[PDB]
Amino acid sequence: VIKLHDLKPAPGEKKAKTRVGRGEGSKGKTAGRGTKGTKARKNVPVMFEGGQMPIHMRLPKLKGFKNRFRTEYQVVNVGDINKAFPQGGTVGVDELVAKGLVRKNSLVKVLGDGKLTVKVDVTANKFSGSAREAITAAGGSATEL
Amino acid sequence: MKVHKGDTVLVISGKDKGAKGKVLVAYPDRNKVLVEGVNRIKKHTAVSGGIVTQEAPIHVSNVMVVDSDGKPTRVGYRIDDETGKKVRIAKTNGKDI
Amino acid sequence: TLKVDVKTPAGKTDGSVELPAELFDVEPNIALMHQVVTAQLAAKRQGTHSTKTRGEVSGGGKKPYRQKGTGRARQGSTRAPQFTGGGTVHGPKPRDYSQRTPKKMIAAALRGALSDRARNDRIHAVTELVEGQTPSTKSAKTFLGTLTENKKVLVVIGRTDEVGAKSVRNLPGVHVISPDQLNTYDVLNADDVVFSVEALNAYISANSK
RNA sequence: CGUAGACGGUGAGAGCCCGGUACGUGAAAACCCGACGUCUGUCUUGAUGGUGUUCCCGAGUAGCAGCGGGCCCGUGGAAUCUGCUGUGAAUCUGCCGGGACCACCCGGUAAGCCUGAAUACUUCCCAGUGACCGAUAGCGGAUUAGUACCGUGAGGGAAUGGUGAAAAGUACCCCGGGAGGGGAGUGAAAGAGUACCUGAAACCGUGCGCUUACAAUCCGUCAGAGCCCUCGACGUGUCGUGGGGUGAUGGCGUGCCUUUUGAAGAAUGAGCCUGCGAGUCAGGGACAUGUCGCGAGGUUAACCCGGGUGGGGUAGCCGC
RNA sequence: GGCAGCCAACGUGUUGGCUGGGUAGGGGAGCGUCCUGCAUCCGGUGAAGCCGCCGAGUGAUCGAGUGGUGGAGGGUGUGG
Ligand SMILES: [Mg+2]
Ligand SMILES: [Mg+2]
Ligand SMILES: [Mg+2]
Ligand SMILES: [Mg+2]
Ligand SMILES: [Mg+2]
Ligand SMILES: [Mg+2]
Ligand SMILES: [Mg+2]
Ligand SMILES: [Mg+2]
Ligand SMILES: [Mg+2]
Ligand SMILES: [Mg+2]
Ligand SMILES: [Mg+2]
Ligand SMILES: [Mg+2]
Ligand SMILES: [Mg+2]
Ligand SMILES: [Mg+2]
Ligand SMILES: [Mg+2]
Ligand SMILES: [Mg+2]
Ligand SMILES: [Mg+2]
Ligand SMILES: [Mg+2]
Ligand SMILES: [Mg+2]
Ligand SMILES: [Mg+2]
Ligand SMILES: [Mg+2]
Ligand SMILES: [Mg+2]
Ligand SMILES: [Mg+2]
Ligand SMILES: [Mg+2]
Ligand SMILES: [Mg+2]
Ligand SMILES: [Mg+2]
Ligand SMILES: [Mg+2]
Ligand SMILES: [Mg+2]
Ligand SMILES: [Mg+2]
Ligand SMILES: [Mg+2]
Ligand SMILES: [Mg+2]
Ligand SMILES: [Mg+2]
Ligand SMILES: [Mg+2]
Ligand SMILES: [Mg+2]
Ligand SMILES: [Mg+2]
Ligand SMILES: [Mg+2]
Ligand SMILES: [Mg+2]
Ligand SMILES: [Mg+2]
Ligand SMILES: [Mg+2]
Ligand SMILES: [Mg+2]
Ligand SMILES: [Mg+2]
Ligand SMILES: [Mg+2]
Ligand SMILES: [Mg+2]
Ligand SMILES: [Mg+2]
Ligand SMILES: [Mg+2]
Ligand SMILES: [Mg+2]
Ligand SMILES: [Mg+2]
Ligand SMILES: [Mg+2]
Ligand SMILES: [Mg+2]
Ligand SMILES: [Mg+2]
Ligand SMILES: [Mg+2]
Numbered sequence: 001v002i003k004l005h006d007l008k009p010a011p012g013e014k015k016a017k018t019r020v021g022r023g024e025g026s027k028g029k030t031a032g033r034g035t036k037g038t039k040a041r042k043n044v045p046v047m048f049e050g051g052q053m054p055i056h057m058r059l060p061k062l063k064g065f066k067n068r069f070r071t072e073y074q075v076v077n078v079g080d081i082n083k084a085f086p087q088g089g090t091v092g093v094d095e096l097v098a099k100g101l102v103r104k105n106s107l108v109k110v111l112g113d114g115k116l117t118v119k120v121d122v123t124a125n126k127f128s129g130s131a132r133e134a135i136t137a138a139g140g141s142a143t144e145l
Numbered sequence: 146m147k148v149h150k151g152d153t154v155l156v157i158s159g160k161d162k163g164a165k166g167k168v169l170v171a172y173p174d175r176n177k178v179l180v181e182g183v184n185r186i187k188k189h190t191a192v193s194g195g196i197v198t199q200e201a202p203i204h205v206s207n208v209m210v211v212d213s214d215g216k217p218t219r220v221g222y223r224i225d226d227e228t229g230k231k232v233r234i235a236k237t238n239g240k241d242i
Numbered sequence: 243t244l245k246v247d248v249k250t251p252a253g254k255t256d257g258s259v260e261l262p263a264e265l266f267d268v269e270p271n272i273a274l275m276h277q278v279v280t281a282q283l284a285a286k287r288q289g290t291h292s293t294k295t296r297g298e299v300s301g302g303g304k305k306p307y308r309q310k311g312t313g314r315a316r317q318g319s320t321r322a323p324q325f326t327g328g329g330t331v332h333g334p335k336p337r338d339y340s341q342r343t344p345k346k347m348i349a350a351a352l353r354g355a356l357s358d359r360a361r362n363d364r365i366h367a368v369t370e371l372v373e374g375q376t377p378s379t380k381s382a383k384t385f386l387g388t389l390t391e392n393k394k395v396l397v398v399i400g401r402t403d404e405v406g407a408k409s410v411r412n413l414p415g416v417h418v419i420s421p422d423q424l425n426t427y428d429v430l431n432a433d434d435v436v437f438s439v440e441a442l443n444a445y446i447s448a449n450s451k
Numbered sequence: 452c453g454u455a456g457a458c459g460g461u462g463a464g465a466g467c468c469c470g471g472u473a474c475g476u477g478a479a480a481a482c483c484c485g486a487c488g489u490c491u492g493u494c495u496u497g498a499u500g501g502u503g504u505u506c507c508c509g510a511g512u513a514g515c516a517g518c519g520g521g522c523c524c525g526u527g528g529a530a531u532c533u534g535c536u537g538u539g540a541a542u543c544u545g546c547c548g549g550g551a552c553c554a555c556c557c558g559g560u561a562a563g564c565c566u567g568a569a570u571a572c573u574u575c576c577c578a579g580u581g582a583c584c585g586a587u588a589g590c591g592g593a594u595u596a597g598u599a600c601c602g603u604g605a606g607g608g609a610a611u612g613g614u615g616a617a618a619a620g621u622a623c624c625c626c627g628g629g630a631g632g633g634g635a636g637u638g639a640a641a642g643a644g645u646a647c648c649u650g651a652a653a654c655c656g657u658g659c660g661c662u663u664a665c666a667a668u669c670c671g672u673c674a675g676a677g678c679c680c681u682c683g684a685c686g687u688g689u690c691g692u693g694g695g696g697u698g699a700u701g702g703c704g705u706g707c708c709u710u711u712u713g714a715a716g717a718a719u720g721a722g723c724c725u726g727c728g729a730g731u732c733a734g735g736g737a738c739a740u741g742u743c744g745c746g747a748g749g750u751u752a753a754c755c756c757g758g759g760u761g762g763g764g765u766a767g768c769c770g771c
Numbered sequence: 772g773g774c775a776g777c778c779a780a781c782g783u784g785u786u787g788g789c790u791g792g793g794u795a796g797g798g799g800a801g802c803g804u805c806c807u808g809c810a811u812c813c814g815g816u817g818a819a820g821c822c823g824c825c826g827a828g829u830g831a832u833c834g835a836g837u838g839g840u841g842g843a844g845g846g847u848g849u850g851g
Contacts, residue, residue, distance in 0.1 A: 002270070002358055004430045004809040005849060010273035013742040016801085020730055025831080029708085031730065034795050036710085100748070104765090148469085157468060158461070159616095176460085176470070177617090187637055189622040196622050196636080203617085204461045206469035219468090274743060280851060283582090283808065285760045287851095291583035300591055301607070320607090324728060326587045327609095332731040334583085340760090342735085342751085346744050348761085377454055401757090408454055412473080423761060431809070448762090463815055463843080582807035582851085642840080649841060651821070 073126065074102045078134050079114020081122075088118035088140075116140075146171075146205065147220035147233055148178060152242075154208035155217045156183050165211065169200070177202040212238065243267075244360060248367040248439060251385055259367045259442060265449055266360040268353050275426065278351035281341040282427045289337040296321055296329030348426070355429045366390075366436045371399065371406035379409045386416065389436075396432035398424065398441040421445045 021031035033040040047054055076096065084099050085091065097104045110122065112130025122135060122142035135142040148154065150171060156162045161183040170179045184201035209217040212235045221234030223241070232241050243263050248256035302320030309316060321328040359365055366389070372381050386395055394415040399406055401420050410418055419428055421441040429435065437445075 001362055002355075002430070004279070006272075006810090007276045007279060007430075007850060008272055009276050009850075010742050013273065015741070018730095023831095030795075032796075146469085160462090184617080184619090186617085186619040187622090188619070189637080191622070194622060199619090201617065201619065204469085206461045209468070217468095271743080276850080277743070279808090282760060283851065287807080288581055289583095290581055293584085293588090294590075302591095304607080326727060327591080328727095330588090331729055335732070337733080344744075344750075346750095350744065379453060383453095405454095408473095412453060412455070414456055419759095420757080420761095423757065423759070425760065427760080427808090433810095463817105582805100640842100649820075 071107075073107050073109035076101055076108055076110045076124075077114050078110065078112050078116050078131055081110075081120060082114060082116050082118060085118060085120055088120045090121040090123070092123045146173065146176075148205050148208065148210060152210050154178075154180060155211045156180075156203070156208055157217075158207050159184065159203070161185070171205070172202065176205050178205045178208065179203070180208065210242070212242070213240070214238070246365065246367045248369055249389070250369055251371075251373070251381075256367075256369050256439075259437075259439070261360065261365075262446070262450075265353060265446070266357050266365075268350075268357045270354050270358050271350065274347065275351045275354055275430075278343060278348055278426050279430065281343045282425065284339045284341050286427075287339060289339055291334055292336050293330050293333040295333040296323055298333075299329045352424070352426050352429065355426050359429065359435055364434050366434075367439060367442065368397075368436055369439050371397065371403075371438070372409050374405060377405045377409040379412055382406070382409045383413065390434050392433040394432040395434040395436060396428060397436045397438070398445075399438050400440045400444070403438075 018027070020027045021029075030040075038044060047056065049055075080101060081091065084101075093108060096102055096108060102108050108124055109126040109128075110124055110131045111128045112132070112134045114134075116134045116138040119138060119140045120135070120142075121140055122131075123145070124142065125145055127142060127144045132142065148168070148171065150168055152168050154166060154168055156164055156166070164183060166180045166182040168178060168180050172178065179200055179202045181200050184203050186199065186201045188197050188199050190197050210220060212218045216237065218238075219236040220242075221236050221239075222231050223234050224231060234240070235242055244261040244266065246259050246261070248259060250256055296319070299321045304320075306317050306320055307314075317324075319328075323329055323331045356365075368389075371385065372378055394417075397406075397410065397416065397418050398421050399418055401422070407418050410416055417428060417432060419425075421444050424445070
């Protein structure tokens with residue numbers, strides 16, 4: 001028997017809003033700024049530390065460039081494949097998308113950190129030596145496009 | 146407005162409720178109607194000066210037209226297919242007034 | 243797992259309706275439903291109100307008088323917040339309070355409210371409210387009076403049914419909502435909730451799909 | 452009663468009293484957008500697919516040199532666009548773009564012209580809405596309002612709403628030259644009489660109780676006799692787990708806020724009251740703290756459809 | 772004799788041990804006003820505002836506690 005009357009917030013979900021400079025009983029005459037000063041009037045810049053050159057100013061820059069033409073992939077773990085494929089078999093980009101391991105559009109790569117014990121046929125783009133050896137030892141195949 | 150000159154009206158509220166009277170003039174601009182015998186007042190006039198009694202206007206909504214049967218009644222309207230004139234209707238009986 | 247006898251205006255039972263547990267048997271969540279209803283009212287409210295600040299009032303952009311020699315207190319503008327008839331210190335602006343609530347939040351809150359409703363046994367089945375091609379508010383009033391005695395009743399009617407909605411519109415303590423327009427605020431507001439057969443079927447199918 | 456229980460007024464909270472609301476109807480004449488019959492204009496001297504070879508397709512332009520602007524680009528290694536000033540190209544194995552630069556391959560044809568649809572804006576008009584204000588607020592302006600008034604100027608710029616249900620706004624008599632008043636009457640009330648609802652505080656008195664004219668004082672507090680009033684039991688006043696108003700007389704006693712190491716300070720501010728007057732606000736902005744759901748998954752913006760807060764929306768986002 | 776914080780034992784809040792002066796400043800828990808939601812209720816047999824008396828709370832206060840003016844609107848509760 002709950003009406004619109006019987007609606008209550010969670011305990012502690014509501015914290016009281018502080019009214020600053022609303023009487024000397026709680027917060028008075030200074031509003032949490034204390035005594036006189038520029039912090040008592042407006043503010044201080046974040047990058048300003050008293051006139052001396054800041055830590056973002058007396059430090060060298062990092063060398064080298066960012067390589068705007070970088071090609072990006074996403075690793076898929078052999079152990080994760082083994083866990084998600086107890087039965088095993090052929091695996092492809094659509095299958096991995098359905099399994100939700102990588103983004104649908106993104107391009108995939110695999111590595112052999114985990115262990116494989118189920119025959120899995122892997123279709124991918126870039127293969128590493130460890131994943132290749134794991135696939136070969138698990139009695140399966142893995143072809144790269 | 147269905148409360149027109151020459152009609153007979155019955156007072157609903159006020160000290161003169163339940164009394165019958167005859168309408169004299171109507172003020173559509175302020176929707177106030179003047180009926181003799183109701184809203185008794187006293188006026189002091191000095192030119193030859195004395196106490197004189199005149200009729201105080203009453204708001205039109207406080208009266209209803211009484212029918213020929215002696216019963217106050219709402220007013221409806223009908224359309225005559227002969228000429229196209231509009232005649233008022235006593236709602237309780239449907240007769241024309 | 244609950245069953246309700248469908249009822250007819252003639253007073254005869256039509257069939258049976260099965261209610262799944264996973265939709266109407268969840269434990270109530272007072273905090274969640276409170277948050278959702280608060281967001282509902284926050285969205286309902288319109289944020290149209292404004293005042294004029296010191297920079298928007300008319301005229302008085304020049305110094306009232308000289309600094310020294312006047313003898314009175316120092317002032318800078320005729321329209322300062324200290325002055326009467328001047329601007330306001332912090333003036334409100336036209337604004338909105340739309341609060342986005344996640345779909346699981348709203349769905350879970352509605353499901354909790356409906357589960358509590360089914361627990362309190364205020365859900366019913368009606369094949370049709372009034373006779374077709376004849377809107378009659380009096381017939382609907384008599385039907386609802388016979389069916390229940392609570393002050394407020396909520397009825398869910400399909401969109402294509404117009405006569406029932408038109409007949410039931412005028413009465414004040416009763417409210418009508420299409421099954422696609424059901425919301426937690428109206429669920430909580432009314433005392434009794436009634437489902438039409440088509441509306442309940444559509445709602446259940448949409449939930450299960 | 453209700454397909455109308457929106458909203459105002461009527462002598463107090465009215466869907467059944469009226470103004471009116473759901474719902475229907477209705478235009479002689481005029482205006483803006485939407486079809487349906489003389490007449491006008493073009494070409495069917497034209498059209499479609501098929502085998503080799505001998506001035507035009509936008510010029511003082513593209514581009515270049517200097518000097519400057521605007522794209523994040525502030526002469527930096529500086530592409531692209533534009534402009535001022537001088538020079539100045541080809542017509543297709545011609546060009547310029549592809550972020551000082553080019554060989555082979557790769558994509559488009561500059562100096563000519565216009566073109567609806569998504570968008571921004573609201574002086575004006577209509578219909579509505581408001582966890583917007585209710586007369587020092589809200590537009591300066593609910594009222595002679597951009598009026599009075601100030602300034603010869605560009606201009607600046609005010610204050611001033613409420614009788615009552617209706618004027619039924621007090622006949623008449625008396626004091627007074629009038630102003631002003633007292634009765635009598637109107638009205639529910641005149642402790643609503645136009646200086647008009649409610650009428651506080653600063654403000655100015657009257658009457659009553661007590662105190663004070665040997666008295667040295669941030670003016671009060673703690674004791675405290677007397678006088679006056681009050682409540683019960685008991686008689687003429689006396690006590691009683693008594694209150695009230697005054698307080699003669701003794702102890703203690705240096706206003707408040709600032710800024711200060713330091714203030715009663717002879718340091719600053721306040722003549723007083725009534726209101727007005729100060730951490731507010733927007734962002735898929737960011738961090739950390741409680742709270743809620745799912746979970747290796749968590750989720751949406753803009754936008755589409757419901758007089759409704761709902762349903763859709765995988766573009767992105769954050770860790771794995 | 773009473774209130775309040777921390778802590779230990781046991782319990783579905785009692786007992787026991789300590790602490791409680793504080794500006795700037797931090798943390799925690801609340802009072803009151805206006806405006807909305809709803810369950811509902813008060814009010815011309817007198818609401819709000821106005822002026823007192825008596826009470827009660829550790830506080831901002833409260834009294835669905837009453838007296839004189841006033842004649843038209845407000846309130847509990849949980850929320851925002
Ligand atoms: Mg200092
Ligand atoms: Mg200071
Ligand atoms: Mg400081
Ligand atoms: Mg300006
Ligand atoms: Mg001011
Ligand atoms: Mg203003
Ligand atoms: Mg907020
Ligand atoms: Mg109404
Ligand atoms: Mg009532
Ligand atoms: Mg009303
Ligand atoms: Mg009426
Ligand atoms: Mg540059
Ligand atoms: Mg360049
Ligand atoms: Mg060309
Ligand atoms: Mg062009
Ligand atoms: Mg356009
Ligand atoms: Mg006022
Ligand atoms: Mg002048
Ligand atoms: Mg009388
Ligand atoms: Mg006065
Ligand atoms: Mg008055
Ligand atoms: Mg004295
Ligand atoms: Mg003496
Ligand atoms: Mg002294
Ligand atoms: Mg002393
Ligand atoms: Mg002394
Ligand atoms: Mg102060
Ligand atoms: Mg100093
Ligand atoms: Mg100091
Ligand atoms: Mg000093
Ligand atoms: Mg002095
Ligand atoms: Mg000095
Ligand atoms: Mg000084
Ligand atoms: Mg001082
Ligand atoms: Mg100084
Ligand atoms: Mg001074
Ligand atoms: Mg002065
Ligand atoms: Mg922030
Ligand atoms: Mg958090
Ligand atoms: Mg949606
Ligand atoms: Mg203890
Ligand atoms: Mg302390
Ligand atoms: Mg402090
Ligand atoms: Mg009364
Ligand atoms: Mg009374
Ligand atoms: Mg009272
Ligand atoms: Mg009154
Ligand atoms: Mg109120
Ligand atoms: Mg209250
Ligand atoms: Mg609440
Ligand atoms: Mg609150």
